[PDB]
Amino acid sequence: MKLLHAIQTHAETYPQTDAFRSQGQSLTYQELWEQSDRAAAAIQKRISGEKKSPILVYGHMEPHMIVSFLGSVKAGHPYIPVDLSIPSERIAKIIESSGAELLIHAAGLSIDAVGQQIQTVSAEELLENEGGSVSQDQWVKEHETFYIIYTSGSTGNPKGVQISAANLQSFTDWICADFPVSGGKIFLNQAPFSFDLSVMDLYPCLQSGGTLHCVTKDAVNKPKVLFEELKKSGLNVWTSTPSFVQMCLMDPGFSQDLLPHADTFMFCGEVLPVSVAKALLERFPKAKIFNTYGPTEATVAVTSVEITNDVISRSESLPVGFAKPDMNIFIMDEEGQPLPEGEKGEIVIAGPSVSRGYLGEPELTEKAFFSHEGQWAYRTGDAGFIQDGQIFCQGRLDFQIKLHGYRMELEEIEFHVRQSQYVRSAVVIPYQPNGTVEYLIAAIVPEEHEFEKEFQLTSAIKKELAASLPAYMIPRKFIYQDHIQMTANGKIDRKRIGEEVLVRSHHH
Ligand SMILES: Nc1ncnc2c1ncn2[C@@H]1O[C@H](COP(=O)(O)O)[C@@H](O)[C@H]1O
C-alpha cells in the first residue's frame, strides 16, 4: 500500500486519531488528509502542471508544514522542505536552481520577511479556497520525484537530492516492517524537515498510523521546557542524531522515568558513540537501540543493527550494521574493484533507495551515481569495510564532514567565506584531535580594511556569512594571515595549515 493510500485509509478509518502534534497544536488524520487535499487543489490554481516543478515549503514544525508537504505531492509536485534555520541567500539559491515556481510558508507572512524571487503564499490563504480537492491520478507516483532535500555542495552551492516516491516507499516499507515501530506508536520528530533524518520518523509514522510529536527549536534551547514536553509527549520511538540524544543524556533526569513509554531509539546520520549506546542501554532498559547508516542520496539509511550489550563489548567502534534487505552494499578500492572481507575500501550503495541524482546537476550526478551491475549505485565517499555481512563506516575520502550531526563541505564554507568583500582567501580547518570534529577554524587572508580591531573584522565577516550559511556552518574561530600555504602540486596544504592554526592557538 503506497504511502499516500495508507494515509488516506487511516483518515477514512480512524479520522479522529492524531497524526501530528506540535507546540500544543494537533492535527487529526482526517484534518491532515482533507487539508492536504484542499491545498493540493489550491496549488494547481497558482502554478502550471506542465512541469513537475518543485514547491518550497517553508517553516519549522507547524502542522501546516506536513499539510503542505502532502498538498504538493497530491497536486503533482515534489516539495522542497526548508527550515527557518536556512538563511535568505541560501534559500534564494535553492529557488534559483530548483526551478520552483511556488513557495508556501506554514506560518503567517513573517513581518519584514526577506522577499524572494518566487510566487509566495501562506498555507492559510491557500486553504481559504473553496472546499475543492484533487483526484487520485494527480498524486506523485512511482519514480516521479516526491521530495527534494538540499545538502552541502563542495562548489559553494547546495545540491538537491531527488527522492522519488518509489525511493521513499522502499525506505518506508523497510522501517515499518523490520523495526519495532509499527503498531500506531507516538514518534518524536526533533530534526527539522529540511534534513532527511526527519523522514526516518515522519513517514514511517504516517504510513503506520502513528502520531508524530515534534519538539521545536524553542523547547530545544530551554532544557526544562524540553524535558517537560518530552515528559508529556509519551513518545515510544525516539528518532534523532546521536548528537542530540548525547546532549539530553548530560541530564541525569533523562531516563526511562522521564519517558516511561519510550521503547525504540532510531539513530542515523552520524557516528553513534559507544558511550551514548552504552548509556542509553542503562537508563532505558525497556528500549532497544538501533544504529542505521546512509547518505541523503540513498534515502536516509540503508543499513541497520540493533545495539546491545553484546555488540558494545564486541567492538570499540559500533558497526553500522547489515544492508537493507533489498540493497546491495559492498566495498570497492580506488581502482573501482570489490575488496574481500576486512579489507578497507569505499562504501558503494546500489538498490531502490538510491536517488536518480542531483536536480539540474548532471555532471555531479555523473561523478557519484552510476549503473553498477544492474542496480543504480552511489559512491558514498565513505571509507569502510564489511565483516561477516556487517558493515562498518570508517571516515571520509573527501572534504565533507560531520559537525554535531550536521553534514557540510569545508570547500563550500570556504567558498562563502571567500565571497565577503573583506576576504581574499579562506581555508577552514576542522579541529578533530581524535575521531570527531569539535569545531571549525577559518584561516583567512583578508583583503584590506579600516577595522581598528580584529574582532570587528571577524564580526563583519560572520555577520555576512549569516545571510548565506546556516549558523552551524559558520566557523567558531577566525584567524588571519598573509598567505595560504600550498603544496608542490599547487594544492592547498591543509595538513600544514592545520598545524599552523594549532600553533597560533598557543599564542595569546
Ligand atoms: N550510523 C552512522 N554511523 C557513522 N556514520 C554515519 C552514520 N550514518 C551516517 N553517517 C555519516 O553521515 C554521512 C551522511 O550524512 P547525511 O546525508 O546528513 O545523512 C554518511 O556518509 C557518513 O559519513
Side-chain angles (χ1 to χ4, degrees):
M1 183 164 248
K2 167 62 186 167
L3 173 60
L4 297 169
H5 284 303
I7 299 176
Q8 173 166 57
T9 302
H10 293 304
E12 289 166 356
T13 307
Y14 313 94
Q16 310 316 318
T17 53
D18 282 353
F20 199 80
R21 286 173 180 168
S22 189
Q23 293 183 295
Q25 303 195 65
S26 70
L27 195 62
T28 69
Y29 269 80
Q30 193 191 70
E31 296 183 302
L32 178 57
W33 188 262
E34 296 300 319
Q35 283 171 57
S36 54
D37 232 84
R38 287 168 60 202
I43 292 183
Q44 291 183 170
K45 290 184 177 179
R46 301 166 189 260
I47 57 175
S48 176
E50 179 168 297
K51 310 167 187 179
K52 295 302 176 169
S53 65
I55 298 179
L56 279 71
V57 173
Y58 186 68
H60 192 50
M61 303 201 196
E62 297 93 331
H64 277 177
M65 284 299 272
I66 189 176
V67 167
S68 299
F69 287 170
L70 256 43
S72 180
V73 300
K74 285 164 87 176
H77 296 66
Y79 67 74
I80 292 173
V82 191
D83 192 84
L84 307 163
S85 175
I86 299 175
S88 62
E89 314 198 326
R90 198 176 186 66
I91 290 171
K93 262 301 173 178
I94 293 167
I95 289 180
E96 184 184 7
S97 58
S98 70
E101 299 190 306
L102 177 59
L103 192 175
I104 305 178
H105 40 95
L109 295 69
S110 186
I111 294 178
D112 195 6
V114 190
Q116 295 293 322
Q117 203 82 61
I118 184 180
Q119 178 175 190
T120 298
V121 298
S122 75
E124 188 182 67
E125 61 187 319
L126 257 194
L127 297 172
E128 299 200 304
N129 100 300
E130 335 102 352
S133 66
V134 295
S135 56
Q136 171 175 145
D137 63 354
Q138 297 296 297
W139 313 346
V140 163
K141 65 186 191 306
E142 303 151 5
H143 308 294
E144 298 164 14
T145 315
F146 186 99
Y147 75 68
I148 300 161
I149 291 188
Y150 284 64
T151 186
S152 258
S154 67
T155 56
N157 299 320
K159 46 184 182 180
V161 176
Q162 316 174 72
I163 301 304
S164 68
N167 278 164
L168 181 62
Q169 192 56 247
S170 177
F171 172 71
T172 305
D173 289 350
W174 172 49
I175 298 291
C176 284
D178 297 3
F179 296 76
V181 302
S182 49
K185 293 184 178 176
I186 300 180
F187 295 63
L188 158 75
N189 181 82
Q190 179 287 312
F193 302 114
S194 216
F195 299 111
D196 80 338
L197 183 158
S198 69
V199 176
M200 179 159 278
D201 50 70
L202 169 51
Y203 293 115
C205 174
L206 287 183
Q207 192 170 87
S208 71
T211 298
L212 197 82
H213 186 292
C214 311
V215 294
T216 65
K217 67 182 62 180
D218 289 310
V220 175
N221 285 291
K222 289 167 292 184
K224 35 283 156 50
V225 186
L226 174 52
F227 284 52
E228 191 186 314
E229 262 296 296
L230 299 180
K231 174 72 172 183
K232 66 187 298 181
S233 80
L235 64 81
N236 305 90
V237 181
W238 177 289
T239 299
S240 74
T241 59
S243 272
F244 180 81
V245 81
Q246 179 165 62
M247 171 157 71
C248 288
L249 280 175
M250 295 192 291
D251 186 295
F254 183 76
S255 60
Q256 203 73 64
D257 306 67
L258 178 72
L259 312 182
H261 302 98
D263 57 44
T264 310
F265 288 86
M266 298 287 285
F267 302 113
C268 197
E270 145 187 43
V271 179
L272 172 65
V274 174
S275 57
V276 184
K278 202 167 186 179
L280 288 179
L281 284 180
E282 178 183 1
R283 314 190 197 174
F284 301 85
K286 294 180 293 180
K288 303 181 175 308
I289 296 67
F290 286 94
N291 184 30
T292 73
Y293 156 96
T296 300
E297 291 85 333
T299 312
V300 196
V302 287
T303 62
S304 172
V305 66
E306 189 183 322
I307 296 303
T308 66
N309 262 61
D310 213 303
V311 182
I312 292 180
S313 57
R314 189 188 298 287
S315 58
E316 287 182 48
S317 178
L318 265 44
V320 288
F322 308 78
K324 177 165 164 282
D326 53 50
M327 297 308 290
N328 189 67
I329 306 177
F330 49 89
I331 302 297
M332 302 183 102
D333 67 299
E334 302 101 307
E335 297 166 294
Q337 307 303 305
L339 306 182
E341 306 237 307
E343 192 79 1
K344 191 173 184 178
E346 185 178 324
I347 296 187
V348 185
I349 299 173
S353 288
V354 181
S355 168
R356 63 158 80 260
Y358 307 130
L359 182 49
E361 291 295 353
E363 300 82 347
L364 294 183
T365 306
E366 199 65 287
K367 276 76 173 180
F369 305 70
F370 68 73
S371 187
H372 179 53
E373 273 166 43
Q375 305 276 57
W376 187 235
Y378 176 75
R379 306 190 175 86
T380 72
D382 294 298
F385 68 78
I386 301 181
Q387 184 65 70
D388 309 359
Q390 189 173 56
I391 308 128
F392 286 70
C393 185
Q394 282 197 304
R396 274 273 143 181
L397 306 176
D398 54 23
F399 294 132
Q400 195 200 86
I401 73 176
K402 273 290 179 173
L403 165 59
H404 299 156
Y406 299 100
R407 167 169 175 181
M408 69 194 82
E409 294 293 338
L410 297 171
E411 301 170 302
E412 179 173 52
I413 295 177
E414 289 162 2
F415 177 79
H416 285 284
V417 175
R418 189 191 315 142
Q419 298 307 294
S420 185
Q421 70 185 75
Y422 316 93
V423 170
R424 169 51 64 71
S425 298
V427 176
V428 181
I429 308 289
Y431 186 66
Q432 47 179 160
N434 192 54
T436 72
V437 181
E438 279 173 42
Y439 59 78
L440 307 179
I441 304 167
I444 302 169
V445 169
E447 278 301 340
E448 186 181 298
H449 52 294
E450 306 77 58
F451 294 123
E452 284 287 354
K453 301 178 181 302
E454 178 179 299
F455 81 77
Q456 309 176 301
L457 175 58
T458 297
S459 299
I461 292 173
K462 282 196 166 200
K463 188 160 61 185
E464 221 161 309
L465 289 177
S468 56
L469 290 183
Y472 60 71
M473 280 188 213
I474 308 178
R476 179 205 289 293
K477 295 193 295 176
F478 278 42
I479 55 86
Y480 306 85
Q481 68 206 210
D482 295 321
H483 300 288
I484 292 303
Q485 305 91 94
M486 253 70 82
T487 60
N489 319 295
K491 288 287 189 176
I492 296 170
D493 205 333
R494 294 177 184 283
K495 181 58 184 180
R496 183 164 295 304
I497 294 173
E499 310 186 322
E500 167 231 311
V501 165
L502 295 194
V503 172
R504 289 183 59 183
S505 192
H506 305 242
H507 298 177
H508 320 289

